[PDB]
Amino acid sequence: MEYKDTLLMPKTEFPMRGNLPNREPKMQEQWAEMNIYEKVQKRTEGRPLFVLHDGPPYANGDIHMGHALNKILKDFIVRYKSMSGFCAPYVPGWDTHGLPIETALTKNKKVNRKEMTVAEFRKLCEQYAWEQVNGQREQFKRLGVRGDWDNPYVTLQPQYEAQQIKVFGDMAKKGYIYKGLKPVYWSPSSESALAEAEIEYYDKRSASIYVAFNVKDGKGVLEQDEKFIIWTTTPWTMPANQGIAVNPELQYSVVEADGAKYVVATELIETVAKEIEWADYKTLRTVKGSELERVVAEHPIYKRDSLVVLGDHVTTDAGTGCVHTAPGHGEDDFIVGQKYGLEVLCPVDSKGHMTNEAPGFEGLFYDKANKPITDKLEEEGALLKLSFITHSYPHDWRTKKPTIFRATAQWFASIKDFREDLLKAVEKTKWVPTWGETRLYNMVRDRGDWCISRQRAWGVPIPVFYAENEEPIITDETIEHVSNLFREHGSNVWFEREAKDLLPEGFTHEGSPNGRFTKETDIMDVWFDSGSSHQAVLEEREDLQRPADLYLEGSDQYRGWFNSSLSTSVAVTGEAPYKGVLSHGFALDGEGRKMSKSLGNVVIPEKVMKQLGADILRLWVASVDYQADVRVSDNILKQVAEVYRKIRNTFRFLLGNLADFNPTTDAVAVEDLREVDRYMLVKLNKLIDKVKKSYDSYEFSSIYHAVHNFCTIDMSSFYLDFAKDVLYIEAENNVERRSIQTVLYETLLSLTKLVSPILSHTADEVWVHIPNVTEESVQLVDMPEVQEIEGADQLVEKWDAFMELRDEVLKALEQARNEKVIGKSLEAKLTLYPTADTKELLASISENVGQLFIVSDLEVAEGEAPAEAQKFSYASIVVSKAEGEKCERCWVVSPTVGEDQDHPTLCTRCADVVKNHYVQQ
Amino acid sequence: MEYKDTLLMPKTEFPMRGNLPNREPKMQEQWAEMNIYEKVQKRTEGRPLFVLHDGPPYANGDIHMGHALNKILKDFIVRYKSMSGFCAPYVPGWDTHGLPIETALTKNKKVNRKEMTVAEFRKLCEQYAWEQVNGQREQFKRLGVRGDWDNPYVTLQPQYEAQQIKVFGDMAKKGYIYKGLKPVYWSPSSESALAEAEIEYYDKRSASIYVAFNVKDGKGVLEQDEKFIIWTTTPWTMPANQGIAVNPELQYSVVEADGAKYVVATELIETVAKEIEWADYKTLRTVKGSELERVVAEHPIYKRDSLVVLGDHVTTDAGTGCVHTAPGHGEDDFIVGQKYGLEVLCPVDSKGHMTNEAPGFEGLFYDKANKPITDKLEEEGALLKLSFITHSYPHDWRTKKPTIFRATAQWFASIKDFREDLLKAVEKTKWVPTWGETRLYNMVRDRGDWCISRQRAWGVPIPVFYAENEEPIITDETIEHVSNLFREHGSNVWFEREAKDLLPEGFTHEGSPNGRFTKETDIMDVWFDSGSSHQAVLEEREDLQRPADLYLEGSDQYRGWFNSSLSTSVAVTGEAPYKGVLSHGFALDGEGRKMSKSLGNVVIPEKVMKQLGADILRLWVASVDYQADVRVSDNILKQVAEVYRKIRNTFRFLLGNLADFNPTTDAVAVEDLREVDRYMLVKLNKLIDKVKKSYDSYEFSSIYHAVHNFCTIDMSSFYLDFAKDVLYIEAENNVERRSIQTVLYETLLSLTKLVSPILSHTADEVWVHIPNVTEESVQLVDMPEVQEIEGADQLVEKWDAFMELRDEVLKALEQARNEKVIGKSLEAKLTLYPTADTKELLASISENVGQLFIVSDLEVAEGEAPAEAQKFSYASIVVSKAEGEKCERCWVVSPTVGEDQDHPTLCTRCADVVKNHYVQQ
Numbered sequence A, B: 001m002e003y004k005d006t007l008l009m010p011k012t013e014f015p016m017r018g019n020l021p022n023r024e025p026k027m028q029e030q031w032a033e034m035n036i037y038e039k040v041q042k043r044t045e046g047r048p049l050f051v052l053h054d055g056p057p058y059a060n061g062d063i064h065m066g067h068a069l070n071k072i073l074k075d076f077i078v079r080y081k082s083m084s085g086f087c088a089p090y091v092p093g094w095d096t097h098g099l100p101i102e103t104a105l106t107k108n109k110k111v112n113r114k115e116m117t118v119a120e121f122r123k124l125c126e127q128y129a130w131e132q133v134n135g136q137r138e139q140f141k142r143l144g145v146r147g148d149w150d151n152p153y154v155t156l157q158p159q160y161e162a163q164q165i166k167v168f169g170d171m172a173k174k175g176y177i178y179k180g181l182k183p184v185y186w187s188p189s190s191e192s193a194l195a196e197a198e199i200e201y202y203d204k205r206s207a208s209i210y211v212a213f214n215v216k217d218g219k220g221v222l223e224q225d226e227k228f229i230i231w232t233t234t235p236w237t238m239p240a241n242q243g244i245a246v247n248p249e250l251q252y253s254v255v256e257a258d259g260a261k262y263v264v265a266t267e268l269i270e271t272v273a274k275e276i277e278w279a280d281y282k283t284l285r286t287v288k289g290s291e292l293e294r295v296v297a298e299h300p301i302y303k304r305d306s307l308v309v310l311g312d313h314v315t316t317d318a319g320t321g322c323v324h325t326a327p328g329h330g331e332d333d334f335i336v337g338q339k340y341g342l343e344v345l346c347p348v349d350s351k352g353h354m355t356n357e358a359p360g361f362e363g364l365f366y367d368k369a370n371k372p373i374t375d376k377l378e379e380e381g382a383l384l385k386l387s388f389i390t391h392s393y394p395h396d397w398r399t400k401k402p403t404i405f406r407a408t409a410q411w412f413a414s415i416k417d418f419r420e421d422l423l424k425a426v427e428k429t430k431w432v433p434t435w436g437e438t439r440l441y442n443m444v445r446d447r448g449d450w451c452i453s454r455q456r457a458w459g460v461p462i463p464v465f466y467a468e469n470e471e472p473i474i475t476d477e478t479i480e481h482v483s484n485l486f487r488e489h490g491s492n493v494w495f496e497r498e499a500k501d502l503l504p505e506g507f508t509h510e511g512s513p514n515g516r517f518t519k520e521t522d523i524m525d526v527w528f529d530s531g532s533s534h535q536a537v538l539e540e541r542e543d544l545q546r547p548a549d550l551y552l553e554g555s556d557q558y559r560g561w562f563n564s565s566l567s568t569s570v571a572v573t574g575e576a577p578y579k580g581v582l583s584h585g586f587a588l589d590g591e592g593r594k595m596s597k598s599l600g601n602v603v604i605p606e607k608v609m610k611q612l613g614a615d616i617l618r619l620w621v622a623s624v625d626y627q628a629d630v631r632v633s634d635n636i637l638k639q640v641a642e643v644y645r646k647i648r649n650t651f652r653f654l655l656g657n658l659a660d661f662n663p664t665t666d667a668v669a670v671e672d673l674r675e676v677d678r679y680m681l682v683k684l685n686k687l688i689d690k691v692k693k694s695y696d697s698y699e700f701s702s703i704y705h706a707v708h709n710f711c712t713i714d715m716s717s718f719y720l721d722f723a724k725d726v727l728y729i730e731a732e733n734n735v736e737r738r739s740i741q742t743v744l745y746e747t748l749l750s751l752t753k754l755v756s757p758i759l760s761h762t763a764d765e766v767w768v769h770i771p772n773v774t775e776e777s778v779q780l781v782d783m784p785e786v787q788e789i790e791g792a793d794q795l796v797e798k799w800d801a802f803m804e805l806r807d808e809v810l811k812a813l814e815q816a817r818n819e820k821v822i823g824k825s826l827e828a829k830l831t832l833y834p835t836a837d838t839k840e841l842l843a844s845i846s847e848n849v850g851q852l853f854i855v856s857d858l859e860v861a862e863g864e865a866p867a868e869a870q871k872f873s874y875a876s877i878v879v880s881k882a883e884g885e886k887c888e889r890c891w892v893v894s895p896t897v898g899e900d901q902d903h904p905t906l907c908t909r910c911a912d913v914v915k916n917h918y919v920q921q
């Protein structure tokens, strides 16, 4: 069809389809060639600092959806702050110590820790961590996250290790760090101790046994015919037994059951009667618990003496009232054991095997030793009832294997001494979400003492020496000298040098007469490694500072990084390491379930960027309420990708219709342009404030919907459809067109900046094509600032009413189309019977209201109720087919067609345009 | 002949605009005359029984959103079951006994109880209660909820009271009912005892004091110059002190602080030192709490003995380690008080005023007595610290005024004697959400005995007689006789006649040799009234049975109706009253804040029904995940109205285009149906399966989204989009048109039946206009069943690919019109450059794909795609202007237009249709 060449069609090299999986890597390569992170940090050099301290992810395996969610949220804030008058350094980190690196390394080539020196094994661990760090670094940078990826912090760095030593020493000189014997969580699979924060409770099968302890010395309160009934679910602790615990205040009874005399707490007589399946049980004598103290009983197996002891831990809620007591396993057994001087017998190997202190079961795994023990109890007749019951049991954090209690000398951290200062730090830090304040406050007050000793090789050694008299040596001189050595040669010097070589020259200890010294071989828990980041990173580096403004990790870090960082920082500095905390939820599937490999519901970040691209994944992050748990799936991302497509088309339209627009000259003053064009500018400015405030308040979901509605409803539904009849049909320098292009140019420039934090790849793609831009990247400009328009309030009042009318005419047009009256709006004549208020609104409008409704004919009658034709709130509307022939250029139905023999198929406007602007009269 | 007169436009009496506020009442009047509930119950009288027992709402005021949510949720299940092969009797209830109704007549109306008897006053209470029942009944009926509204149950009914008396008697017979002197919640405003279910915790500002108790005799452990420090926020409990409670296994230290020696717990010394603001405090000695048992302390005011007592309840979490023990104002104080034989002193009366047992403070309100006590304490030199704090405090359920603890003789139900049976009953019940099992399991395990006696007038009497020896009389003979009298005369007979006339004719009790008897005046707890509804309704009504299938109430009923109904039912029957329980959350506003008259964020069902209609509110209930707290505002409902309009438009299209369709003659069998038509039937069968399975799982939001998507993307956007061309233009008996009408008629029947439980008003509105229908209402038919379609897997495999192709085609068409290439899809030629798979798909479709794309021309090219082509996954598409002339009838652009000289403006198809069917026969 002719006259198609006489239209000003959109023209832009910005493609309709982004092809993000193949385009984004080019953008990322171009960003790196720019050194964009250095450019932004140098442009904002003289700006108030905003420091978001990166929590160190563990350097093992590929990044999961939680890693992408965490890093993308951080990237949003750092990018926004870099464009809002702040200097926003970002130093990503990595946690590179602990058991997981050791276990993965061992089976990588079936290498063994016993075939290599500890120093050699650690060096391979360091190599493995660096390989994992590099893999995660390139995956993170594929997400589009900007940062100092070439100068990260890793916990294996000698400078990091040295600073961690100082943090340990400061807590040591303040009395917070102490050593002592205590039953602690132990993982036989890991052959090292654990902590309550490292223990998860899972259900397991256990043997519930009722054992009989026959009395040896009744001490005038019991006879020898009577026996004590203990109940335990851990038969492997029986070889460690040292006594029977009874509650002093509780009343105990002697029971005649099945021809035997049994001692059981009175309140649990019938409960035990059901369990042991007694027949005709009679109560003989009732006694008080304090009477039973120091009564001598006999161990069923070894026939040694068990001392009846008084303890509060005895409860009538579950059991027999008489509690088997072994100080080696169980803390409540230990406290009462030390009260009476009972021996701390712990006959379990570091690998879970019974040692020489358990005759008849030596060299057996404890779970495999339960049956020989229960059999031995039956042989002597001490076994009363055996029933297997499933119950909650402590388990290892990663190996998911059961953990037992062993009485071993470890190192601990006393939160109690400075617990008040922790509380003041909990309230002084802003918490988003708000309930996090209560979560950490209850954690601090209910906290016990933090065990910090691990019997592993890969980690930071405990910088403690021992003299000849076996006394711990922790002075400020020793801590400082160790820290300097770790700074110079790393933590491996602790395992390749003698203890005398790790102390200052000429070091003398009053407990060491011959100058002989020994060194601790334990290492710190990795929660101490990651918790010292505020000292080794925030305060060590020039580009950062302490406290950091923000700490952004998941909700699982209230027990971890949020807690460990506070404990060390308050201990050493007296204040919190963060000015505020932001917490996000976990990533779930579409069904709302946790992702697991067995179910196959895991969404891999690598596959999302291979199939959809990073920008979509970031747009998903902005679309969800991160502060609670979120969902993501193939269908959920497809919905986001459709939204991203709508936004991208909005950008392409702006660029396409600005191809002939010079912002330096062709721009129209806001006063001089039209009201409807000025109305869109006000809406743009309303959008600018909402997005910036939503960025400030960290409400990114609001940004997601605000831009989505602006692109779909405000721009494409009304303004872009309305602008087609001017941008395409009218002359290039038509005053109405230049006013439209001016609003489009303003909309394009501001919207590109607004979405730069989130759609980082697309924003720079749009930015290059924007006319009259003089910066390399949109990241190098500040956010748009709201401008107030003269008479904005009156302008909004008038045109908000017009939009109400426009919605009503749109419904009427849709109904008319459904009744086969018109195929499109241009084929329609709209006659309006309005209210007097509606009429005065239409008289105040100087624009072609028919063109604003995209119709060929608009009539406002003098006033007469029609024959029941589309009654609406503002007016009654009749939709008629327009009269005349259709112009072959703008497809309007007007009688003006054919009034000029030159171009006899065109209307007056289109004939003039070709005559005067393509032929020039 | 006008060409528009030759189009088969839709014709139906179903209005486009619902006008639900003005038309739903007419529907409800039509239901009322039908006796639709009676008809449904009779139609299904042989069907198996499903019982959803209605929880009785209090009849005091208008219904709120929680009520509307509850009933509509109940109405969903009862309606669905009645259509799913069950008999579903729904019997609404009302709780009519209670203090709020008693208070309203006393205060709001001009009723003085001096002028009338108690029985006459209760008659007024019944009259006021009935008015509220009638008011709520109409409001509930306006929601559209079906049920036996004309024969409901109320707690004041003589039969209801007769069975409640039976419940008391059976529990009393089993020994679960007793009268005892124990501390209970007491409301001074109501002058009555209370229960934790009738307690609301509010913030209260009280005075926090620290009081020194001098030591009278240290018994070799303490010294005469040493003192106990106690902490309390209730100074009015000081006159009732009897001793100092300590924890037997906590360590207590004698601390000399600012020239005074005090006894506090070791772990609380620093906390105490901060509150009293001690300057110099030193720990002198240390003893365990067990050693302090014999110590006798001095009461600060009255100088009487204060026995140090040992108690497990004494905690180190707040105040000092020493708690002042008043057995008459606390549960834990009473337990230890009985252990040591302490006097149960309650110097406060039922009106909250200090009695003579508190010399120096007699006649004062407890709040007004705190200041004199603290002043006297300071004058005696025992007040170490006075502070004012704000903390959560128990308040009255009705008056919203703070309560106190008073030791009084009340009636209790001993849960402890059958708590094992309750817990087993909880585990044999299904809970949705599942966590509701944990809530009741923990509540039953951790609860005390239930105080069931109230000192009010409006409620069921406690059916106990007392003899001359003042011993209680509860026998099966007396309980049945009272129950018979209550069934024939009502509960007022207890307040009208005397005790002798309330006993059996010949009654002999050894405790009344003279024959004189007395009757208890206390009434039952309103929770007992509601908690007996299983015996008083399910076992009494012959259309119901016990156990009920389902209890459906809010999350506030785990302590309320669910617990009390379980407690009475398990006591009397040994089983739970319900097979399963469904819990819903509370209704919030758009921001998620609780509704409040202060904020003005309350959504009133009465207004919603007057401005939007019940069906919108019913549609919102299905729209939310009711099993947790939900949100609703005017904007939220307006969003739901948009969804309703789409659904109503879908129904209006089906009715309009089935005007000429008679199923008896014009139906096309599935074998003779087209593939795309059978493909729609396959998708319809999938809708049937998911919707019915979602009703069975109580997952209504699934039905909400499934129906919305089916009407919008599967029907309005896809099937109805190309059905218009056949339906409006082709001949009436055209087989393609009949095939579409067959699918529409099948969908119209299934859709109306599926949505009947939710959009009840609109489903019956559509059902009347459905062609060739015999049943009076949609409620009187069963749900549609899923029928297999041959080749469904192959049908879905193909046409799903076609649907995805069409969406890409639609995206291409939308882009073309935005570039002024076309104005309408009918003005376009589609040129497709398909992939290899797409080429196969388009060859396997026997239908006119160009017709299915609503275009005038389609061309699948074999050449390379041009550079300007729109790239997509399935194909590269070029949208051009269709060649030819537009047909005046069907608006298609074909070269065949202008061939028929009899119809110069018609294409070949339209010209033949007019000539063979509209000009001729």
Ligand SMILES: C/C(=C\C(=O)OCCCCCCCCC(=O)O)C[C@@H]1OC[C@H](C[C@@H]2O[C@H]2[C@@H](C)[C@H](C)O)[C@@H](O)[C@H]1O
Pocket: A055, A056, A057, A058, A064, A065, A066, A067, A070, A095, A530, A552, A553, A554, A555, A556, A557, A560, A561, A584, A585, A586, A587, A588, A595, A596, A597, A598, A602, A603
């Ligand atoms: C919300 C989270 C995971 C998630 O949402 O994961 C959901 C996706 C899991 C997919 C399943 C994986 C396959 C295994 C299976 O079978 O299940 C937790 C967050 O992770 C990111 C960050 C991890 C950093 O290391 C932590 C630092 C702070 C500490 C000092 O060490 C941190 O912010 C963390 O809190």
Ligand SMILES: C/C(=C\C(=O)OCCCCCCCCC(=O)O)C[C@@H]1OC[C@H](C[C@@H]2O[C@H]2[C@@H](C)[C@H](C)O)[C@@H](O)[C@H]1O
Pocket: B055, B056, B057, B058, B064, B065, B066, B067, B070, B095, B530, B552, B553, B554, B555, B556, B557, B560, B561, B584, B585, B586, B587, B588, B595, B596, B597, B598, B602
């Ligand atoms: C989910 C609920 C309220 C809600 O969601 O409230 C939302 C609306 C609150 C309106 C507040 C108005 C402003 C007040 C202000 O000023 O603050 C609670 C449920 O209610 C329905 C039913 C009530 C029946 O009587 C209960 C029975 C079972 C018992 C035996 O008596 C029951 O299911 C109940 O559990």
Ligand SMILES: [Cl-]
Pocket: A685, A686, A689, A786
């Ligand atoms: Cl503004």
Ligand SMILES: [Cl-]
Pocket: none
């Ligand atoms: Cl004219």
Ligand SMILES: [Cl-]
Pocket: B197, B450, B527, B559, B563, B564
């Ligand atoms: Cl209760």
Ligand SMILES: [Cl-]
Pocket: B432, B697
């Ligand atoms: Cl279920």
Ligand code: NA
Pocket: A084, A085, A086
């Ligand atoms: Na600033």
Ligand code: NA
Pocket: A713, A714, A718, A803
């Ligand atoms: Na609008």
Ligand code: NA
Pocket: B447, B448
């Ligand atoms: Na209790």
Ligand SMILES: [Zn+2]
Pocket: A887, A888, A889, A890, A891, A892, A906, A907, A908, A909, A910, A911
């Ligand atoms: Zn024109």
Ligand SMILES: [Zn+2]
Pocket: B887, B888, B889, B890, B891, B892, B906, B907, B908, B909, B910, B911
């Ligand atoms: Zn035609």
